[PDB]
Copies of this chain bind each other. A is one copy, B any other.
Amino acid sequence: TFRKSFDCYDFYDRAKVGEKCTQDDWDLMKIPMKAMELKQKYGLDFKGEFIPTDKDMMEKLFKAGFEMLLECGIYCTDTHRIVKYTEDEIWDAINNVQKEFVLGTGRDAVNVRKRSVGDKAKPIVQGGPTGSPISEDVFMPVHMSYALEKEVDTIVNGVMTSVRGKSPIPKSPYEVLAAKTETRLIKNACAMAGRPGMGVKGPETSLSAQGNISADCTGGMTCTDSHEVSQLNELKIDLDAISVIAHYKGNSDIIMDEQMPIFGGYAGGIEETTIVDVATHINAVLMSSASWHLDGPVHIRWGSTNTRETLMIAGWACATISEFTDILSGNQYYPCAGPCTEMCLLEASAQSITDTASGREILSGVASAKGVVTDKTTGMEARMMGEVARATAGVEISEVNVILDKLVSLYEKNYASAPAGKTFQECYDVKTVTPTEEYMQVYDGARKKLEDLGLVF
């Protein structure tokens, strides 16, 4: 049996005396070799399916992901050493995960409970800029565009490009100011939308450990909000994250561990990246004591989470995690196209269909324009994400796979030419925080194509 349930403290201890290893030995050898070995050993083959129906194949994928974590361990970038877990420690973590939890407060609070593959229940819709850069002068209006949407249940924070006219440079006092201010302003926006108790997810503007740790404050982030900590690529972590985890745990905060496995990255192809994905879902409740895990398979070239391959990775990982564990999870949205374009909505829709049908409990989006273009995210994308989730809930998996194949085909040939889209200020009346007729017409066009594919709203 194990000595004690594993936590961030044990991780630090082991990271100091673990096996020495270069980061290249890890990224270019250990990880890719194990993923390759396990894929063949377990004969993993997704056969073009977005969401699995072959339970035998799913079980093999689960065992592969578990074995990957067990045999490889986790690389600590700061100490350049490997942290190894024992089989019993991993099972202790998997067998004792958070069953459910509440986000937000008062009338606006929502319950997050497990969803199975093809579940009739709708997932939680977490809408917001999704970590994208937002101008300070429209920080509240932009987030208000999500709170005003009944489709949205909780908010995923955007990033303040400036606070008091200055960049929130890491380790500067401005970073601390932004970490606290970020959620204070966002909750203020939610209140103006008549939903003062909406739960949020962050802190996003802060990047350093001290920055993230300063986010919990009166009027700001509290224990009923999801607190983010990010794992690195792949099966890797920095000590900054370890200290942040200790802080979240010390404040009884709901913890959201995230990881974005890269398709075509250090792990390799689809099955390989999915093996890593399953391993990081497990690592989330082991290393980070996570309440839930946020996935986000991303294409090494396109940088989107909704390419055919990344959707398959998320679909198999979630269906498998949902089938063999009680780990709560979600997925983040990164379309290529920008707001106010049909492609953006179709890209997000494909992922919403995949995430909903595969069993995700939370949908966190949408980081339109790949989430790197200032002010290019609006509530309209979250609305589509939500309506599509409802339309997908309860639909037979065989049907879903057919719809996805057809839908993804509608845009997968245009990644390089994805439309830039428009900023919030361009497709919304900023003063009343209402979308323009232009956006409403684009929305209808996308919705129609989805209906023509078989989706019933």
Give the docked Cα–Cα distance between A162 and B192 (Å).
12
Q: Mark A245-273, 1 if CB is under 8 A from B, else 0.
A: 11101111111000000000000000000
The complex places the Cα of A210 from the Cα of B162 at a distance, in Å, of 22
**Is A246 a contact partner of B12 (Cβ separation < 8 A)?**
no
Counting chain B CB atoms within 10 Å of each CB, the highest count among A219, A239, A252 belongs to A252
Provide the A1-20 mask, 1 if CB < 8 A to any CB of B, else 0.
10111011101110000000
Q: Which of B100, B165, B210, B246 contacts A431 (CB under 8 A)?
A: B165
Residue with the greatest number of chain B CB neighbours at <10 A, chosen from A93, A180, A194, A213 = A194
Tell me if A99 counts as interface (CB < 8 A to partner B): yes
Which B residues are CB-close (under 8 A) to A196? 218-219, 250-252
Residue from B92, B99, B173, B181 within 8 A of A9 (CB atoms)? B173
Give the most central of A137, A162, A208, A249: most B CB within 10 Å.
A249
A252 with B197: in contact, given A96-B150, A176-B247, A239-B171 (CB under 8 Å)? Answer: yes
A433→B214 contact, CB < 8 A: no
Residues in B with CB closer than 8 Å to A7 are: 148, 194
CB–CB B164/A433 < 8 A = yes
Minimum CB–CB distance for A308 against chain B, Å? 27
Q: Which residues of B contact A187 (CB under 8 A)?
A: 219
Given contacts A8-B173, A95-B390, 5 further A-B contacts (CB under 8 A): A3-B440, A7-B148, A105-B252, A176-B243, A188-B188
Show 15 A/B contacts (Cβ-Cβ < 8 Å), sorted by A.
Answer: A3-B435, A4-B434, A9-B173, A12-B173, A98-B107, A106-B253, A166-B432, A173-B243, A173-B246, A176-B246, A184-B191, A188-B188, A194-B250, A195-B252, A214-B247
